[PDB]
Design an enzyme around this catalytic site. Structure first.
Site, PDB file in Angstrom:
ATOM      1  N   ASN A   1      -7.274 -19.810 -10.818  1.00  0.00           N
ATOM      2  CA  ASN A   1      -8.581 -19.202 -10.697  1.00  0.00           C
ATOM      3  C   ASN A   1      -8.483 -17.776 -10.190  1.00  0.00           C
ATOM      4  OD1 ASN A   1     -11.389 -19.048  -8.803  1.00  0.00           O
ATOM      5  ND2 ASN A   1     -11.466 -20.069 -10.767  1.00  0.00           N
TER       6      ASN A   1
ATOM      7  N   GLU B   1       0.784  -1.220   0.000  1.00  0.00           N
ATOM      8  CA  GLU B   1       0.000   0.000   0.000  1.00  0.00           C
ATOM      9  C   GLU B   1       0.823   1.282   0.000  1.00  0.00           C
ATOM     10  OE1 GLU B   1      -3.072   0.317  -0.449  1.00  0.00           O
ATOM     11  OE2 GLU B   1      -3.793  -1.757   0.049  1.00  0.00           O
TER      12      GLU B   1
ATOM     13  N   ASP C   1      -6.814   6.717  -4.624  1.00  0.00           N
ATOM     14  CA  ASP C   1      -6.219   5.397  -4.806  1.00  0.00           C
ATOM     15  C   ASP C   1      -6.250   4.998  -6.298  1.00  0.00           C
ATOM     16  OD1 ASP C   1      -8.785   4.511  -5.285  1.00  0.00           O
ATOM     17  OD2 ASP C   1      -8.836   3.117  -3.609  1.00  0.00           O
TER      18      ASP C   1
END
Ligand SMILES: [Cl-]
Ligand SMILES: [Cl-]
Length: 162
Positions: A132, A11, A20
């Protein structure tokens, strides 16, 4: 390495309000303020969060304080979630961190929607789940970060963050 260090890498750390990757007003260490387009609304939420008139700026200590609360909340979100808990309980310590990361970034709800991957993780089908997980908006929008988390689930090691 640990969850704190990990998220801090994903972050970053910013002392001034910022937008963001999705264009939402954030501050500190990935602390979302609001999805509204209004900076004032942002400033507002921020002041409410800090209990003081910030004028859109905080200290390192304050950022860190948010970050702590945000980690804790995430764990707690997982633990209270019927689809998440069991997954988290089945995992080892590193992989747990990986689950936490995804939850911190996207919300317990967002995460609980990877039903299929979740199931695979639960069954310890590491390569399949990695595959996946990658078929998702999440991966397409924040590929580097997604890659790191996914490797983490795949290997059960911190290599991607070394
Ligand atoms: Cl808050
Ligand atoms: Cl990225």
């Amino acid at each position: 390495m640990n969850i704190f260090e990990m998220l801090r890498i994903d972050e970053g750390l910013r002392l001034k309000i910022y937008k963001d990757t999705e264009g939402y007003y954030t501050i500190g260490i990935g602390h979302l303020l609001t999805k509204s387009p209004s900076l004032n609304a942002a400033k507002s939420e921020l002041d409410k969060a800090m209990g003081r008139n910030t004028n859109g700026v905080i200290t390192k200590d304050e950022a860190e304080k948010l970050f702590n609360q945000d980690v804790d909340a995430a764990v707690r979100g997982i633990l209270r979630n019927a689809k998440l808990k069991p997954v988290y309980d089945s995992l080892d310590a590193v992989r747990r961190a990986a689950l936490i990361n995804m939850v911190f970034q996207m919300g317990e709800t967002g995460v609980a929607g990877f039903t299929n991957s979740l199931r695979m993780l639960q069954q310890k089908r590491w390569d399949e789940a990695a595959v996946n997980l990658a078929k998702s908006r999440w991966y397409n929008q924040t590929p580097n970060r997604a890659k790191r988390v996914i490797t983490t689930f795949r290997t059960g090691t911190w290599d991607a963050y070394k």
